[PDB]
């Protein structure tokens, strides 16, 4: 079975599966955990940076795409770079040509369409990274989950990566609670850190290990690392 239908993306299995795409998804899981949640005024990204050695850094997992948009990565870093960069251009284009900030919903459509291309043509490989996009546009706060399959979904909150299932259940519970953390950033963040810890196990989120980013009504997407997050550990 599988072994004969997983040689490349252009092949369908007898059941209708694209194993290469599936294996790509498998790289997301092996990736460190990250979480995103939004109220009606803000949206927050709390990502757990992973380290190789105790002599190595905790590889950055949050990329800014424009003053009003950003995302967190879980999987192959290079692929997130490629994709984030593409998104940065789309945002830039929208501004320069139409003097209009790119709708988060539309950024999602662009990401889906770009990923889909690497799953129908010979030679290419799917993207091996998952993305969580947050942003404040002409219709409020937004949160998007991007899967290499090409599937992009808008949620109130969510998480991806290893043990990501913990945080996701916690938020599926805390829903009614954080969704109303309007006007208060520090609360939405804390609410996030309390979701990300729901997927810990190995250790505890240190200072040079925690990474948070936020955007909203009067907050240009910004990223906090280290001392900046100390007050959240």
Partner 1 sequence: GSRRYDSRTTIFSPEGRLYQVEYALESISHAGTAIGIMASDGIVLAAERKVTSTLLEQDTSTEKLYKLNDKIAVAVAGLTADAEILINTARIHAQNYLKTYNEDIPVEILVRRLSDIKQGYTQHGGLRPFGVSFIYAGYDDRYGYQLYTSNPSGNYTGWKAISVGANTSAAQTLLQMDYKDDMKVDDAIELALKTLSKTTDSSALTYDRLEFATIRKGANDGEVYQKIFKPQEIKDILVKTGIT
Partner 2 sequence: QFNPYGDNGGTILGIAGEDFAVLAGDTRNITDYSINSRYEPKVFDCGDNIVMSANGFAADGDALVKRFKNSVKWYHFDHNDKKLSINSAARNIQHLLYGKRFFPYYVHTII
Partner 3 sequence: DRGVSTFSPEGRLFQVEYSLEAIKLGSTAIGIATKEGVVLGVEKRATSPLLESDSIEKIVEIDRHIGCAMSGLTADARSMIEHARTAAVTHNLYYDEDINVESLTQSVCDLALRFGEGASGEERLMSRPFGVALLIAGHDADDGYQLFHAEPSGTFYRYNAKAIGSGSEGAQAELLNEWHSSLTLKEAELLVLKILKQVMEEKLDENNAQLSCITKQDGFKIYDNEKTAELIKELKEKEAAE
Torsion, Cα 21 111 217 169, to 10 degrees, reads: -10
**Dist. CA 100–CA 107, nearest whole Å:** 13
Pairing of strands 157-160, 62-66: unpaired
- The binder of 55, among partner 3, partner 1, partner 2, none, by C-beta within 5 to 8 A per type, is partner 3
The Cα–Cα gap between 208 and 40 comes to 29
Taking CB under 8 A as the binding criterion, the range among 29-37, 70-78, 88-96, 152-160 that sits at the site for partner 2 is 88-96
Task: Provide, rounded to whole angstroms, the least separation between the CB of residue 50 and partner 3.
Answer: 10
CA distance 188 to 122: 44
- Containing 88, the helix (H) or strand (E) segment is helix 77-98
CA distance 109 to 170: 28
Site string (101-140) toward partner 2, x via CB under 8 A: ----------------------------------------
Write each residue from 117 to 156 as x if it is in contact with partner 1 (CB under 8 A), else as -, in one continuous string. Answer: -----xx---------------------------------
What would the two tokens of residue 70 be? 């950003």
Residue 134 CB, shortest distance to partner 3, in Å, is 23
By CB under 8 A, how many residues form the interface with partner 3?
Answer: 36
30 is a site residue for partner 3 (CB under 8 A): yes
225/47 Cα distance (integer angstroms) = 10
8 binds partner 1 (CB under 8 A): yes
Q: Say which entry of partner 3, partner 2, partner 1, none residue 151 contacts (CB below 5 to 8 A, set by partner kind).
A: none
Cβ burial of 23 (10 Å; 0-12, 13-18, 19+) is middle
Q: Does 230 participate in binding partner 1 (rule CB under 8 A)? A: no
Q: Report if residue 10 touches partner 1, rule: CB under 8 A.
A: yes
Residue 121 Cβ vs partner 1, minimum distance, rounded to whole Å: 10
Q: Which chain residues interact with partner 1 by CB under 8 A?
A: 8, 10, 122-123
């Amino acid at each position: 079975f599988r072994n004969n239908y997983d040689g490349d993306t252009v092949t369908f299995s007898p059941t209708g599966r694209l194993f290469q795409v599936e294996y790509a998804l498998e790289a997301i899981k092996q990736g460190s955990v990250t979480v995103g949640l939004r109220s009606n005024t803000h949206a927050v990204l709390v990502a757990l940076k992973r380290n190789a050695d105790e002599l190595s850094s905790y590889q950055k997992k949050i990329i800014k795409c424009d003053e009003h948009m950003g995302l967190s990565l879980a999987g192959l870093a290079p692929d997130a770079r490629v994709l984030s960069n593409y998104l940065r251009q789309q945002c830039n284009y929208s501004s320069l040509v139409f003097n209009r900030k790119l709708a988060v919903e539309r950024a999602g459509h662009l990401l889906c369409d770009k990923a889909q291309k690497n799953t129908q043509s010979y030679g290419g490989r799917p993207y091996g990274v998952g993305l969580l996009i947050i942003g404040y546009d002409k219709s409020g706060a937004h949160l998007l989950e991007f899967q290499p399959s090409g599937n992009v979904t808008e949620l109130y909150g969510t998480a991806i990566g290893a043990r990501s299932q913990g945080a996701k259940t916690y938020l599926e519970r805390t829903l009614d609670t954080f969704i109303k953390i309007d006007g208060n950033p520090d609360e939405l963040i804390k609410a996030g850190v309390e979701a990300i810890s729901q997927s810990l196990r190995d250790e505890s989120l240190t200072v040079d290990n925690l990474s948070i980013a936020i955007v909203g009504k009067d907050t240009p997407f910004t990223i906090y690392d280290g001392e900046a997050v100390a007050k959240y550990i």
